[PDB]
Amino acid sequence: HMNVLVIGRGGREHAIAWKAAQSPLVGKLYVAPGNPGIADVAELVHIDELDIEALVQFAKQQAIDLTIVGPEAPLASGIVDRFMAEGLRIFGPSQRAALIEGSKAFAKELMKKYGIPTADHAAFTSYEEAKAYIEQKGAPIVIKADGVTVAQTVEEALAAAKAALVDGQFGTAGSQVVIEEYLEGEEFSFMAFVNGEKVYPLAIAQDHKRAYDGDEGPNTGGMGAYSPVPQISDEMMDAALEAILRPAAKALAAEGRPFLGVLYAGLMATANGPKVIEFNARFGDPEAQVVLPRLKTDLVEAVLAVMDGKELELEWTDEAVLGVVLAAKGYPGAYERGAEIRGLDRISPDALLFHAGTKREGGAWYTNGGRVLLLAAKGETLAKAKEKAYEQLAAIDCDGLFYRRDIGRRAIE
């Protein structure tokens, strides 16, 4: 009966649409702009994410009962504010609330004010002030120019700090250097539906940020993920929930920025407890691809419950899920498009193939984005999942693509 619209074009959106299309409450599902893979489970709507004005009209004429925003951009432009001023129900944060992701300085500002555990952070335009500060926090310490160096010693730290200010980009306020506390521990992604002060935790997942095996290379939007994460104890998870997620939700509300949608915490389980690395104001990608398939509860039913302030208890499958990203060579740097992708039809039907940047033409598939696809497999254990996943990937033939082989290695071994 319901008409649902999903905004975005990546694998995270294929995941959301795929899950929504299974809701008995859904009468019809649209995704704008979506992608060729997504069209297999939803009708595509050829409107751009940032084209907020056209999106509003569509929602109105098509009687969209619920809209779910995938990417950060439209949120940052305030797609939620426009929709709400049109009586359109949308799951996502206002522009002011989305600042939790938009500005890292603001996130640090908020966390310090409300005592949310996170790595010490300080910006400087004066070398002397950065020096005095460095000599107070000791090393290893993180120095970030405008690039990132983990100074093993204080001397190295000062040398890198000086160089960051001397050779960094000259902003309108001159050059600047950021000094971040070095943290050690296991990283994890803790997402949760949020509406004002109510928090509804989702299962935990672990991202793989580095482009190459052994977490080598530059950072990416995420090269793979799995859920659950056995090595992160439930104590650590509960700690994160009560000292980070709930207090962050309360903090944003206390600041005239009540949050609605998916609060995504990039955390690190340190010996002293969980600590925030970063905050995202939407579903993580590829975290959505491995977490949603484990959600037994109806996603559309769950979302409406969050919006209607109803109590909710999400159920999860015992099976684990592990997904691997296939990216165009060069990603996250310059990459090419137009490489024919062969074998997608050879893939087992039990494999979860989420499209993130593909194109269809003359009855063929072609790379068309940084991250192109993600193949996830379900398994009784993470080990079984990892095996089924890589097993399927080998069926794909395309030299223009690459992917890490070590996804889930931290869980298994």
Give the CA distances from residue 55 to residues 8, 11, 92, in Å, rounded to whole numbers and listed in that order. 12, 20, 15
Give the CA distances from residue 165 to residues 133, 139, 160, in Å, rounded to whole numbers and listed in that order. 15, 19, 9
Residue 381 burial by Cβ neighbours in a 10 Å radius (0-12, 13-18, 19+)? middle
187 is in an annotated binding site: yes
In which residue are the tokens 């996130």 written?
Answer: 107
Q: What angle do CA 1, 294, 288 make, to 5 degrees?
A: 80
Q: Please give the resolution of this entry in Å, rounded to 1 decimal.
A: 2.2
128 is in an annotated binding site: no
Query: Do residues 398 and 339 lie in contact, with contact meaning Cβ atoms separated by under 8 Å?
Result: yes
Q: Name residue 301's beta-bridge partners.
A: none
Angle formed by the axes of helices 11-20 and 299-307, nearest 10°:
90
CB atoms within 10 A of CB 266: 18
| Tokens representing residue 376 in the block | 């996830």
Domains belonging to the chain, first-starting first, are 3-94 (3.40.50.20), 120-183 (3.30.1490.20), 184-319 (3.30.470.20), 320-413 (3.90.600.10)
| Tokens representing residue 35 in the block | 């992608």
Q: How was this one solved? A: X-ray
Give dist(CA 15, CA 353) in Å, integer. Answer: 9
Angle formed by the axes of helices 246-254 and 104-113, nearest 10°:
100
Three-class secondary structure of residue 194 per DSSP = strand
Mention every residue, 6+ apart, whose C-beta is less than 8 A from residue 373. 11, 37, 325, 326, 341, 353, 354, 355, 356, 357, 358
- Which of these, 374, 195, 410, lies nearest to 291 by C-alpha position? 374
Give dist(CA 192, CA 174) in Å, integer. Answer: 38
Give dist(CA 214, CA 225) in Å, integer. Answer: 14
Residue 237 burial by Cβ neighbours in a 10 Å radius (0-12, 13-18, 19+)? buried
Instruction: Calculate the CA 341 to chain-centre distance.
Output: 26
Give dist(CA 33, CA 36) in Å, integer. Answer: 10
158 is in an annotated binding site: no
Q: What angle do CA 383, 385, 387 make, to 5 degrees?
A: 70
The kind and range of the H/E element at 50 are: none
Q: Which ranges in 210-296 belong to alpha helices (H)? A: 234-240, 246-254, 287-291
Mention every residue, 6+ apart, whose C-beta is less than 8 A from residue 338. 366, 367, 368, 400
Half-sphere exposure of 182 (CA within 13 A, CB side): 16
Give dist(CA 373, CA 36) in Å, integer. Answer: 12
346-355 as b/e: b if 16+ CB within 10 A: eeeeebbbbb
Query: Do residues 278 and 216 lie in contact, with contact meaning Cβ atoms separated by under 8 Å?
Result: no
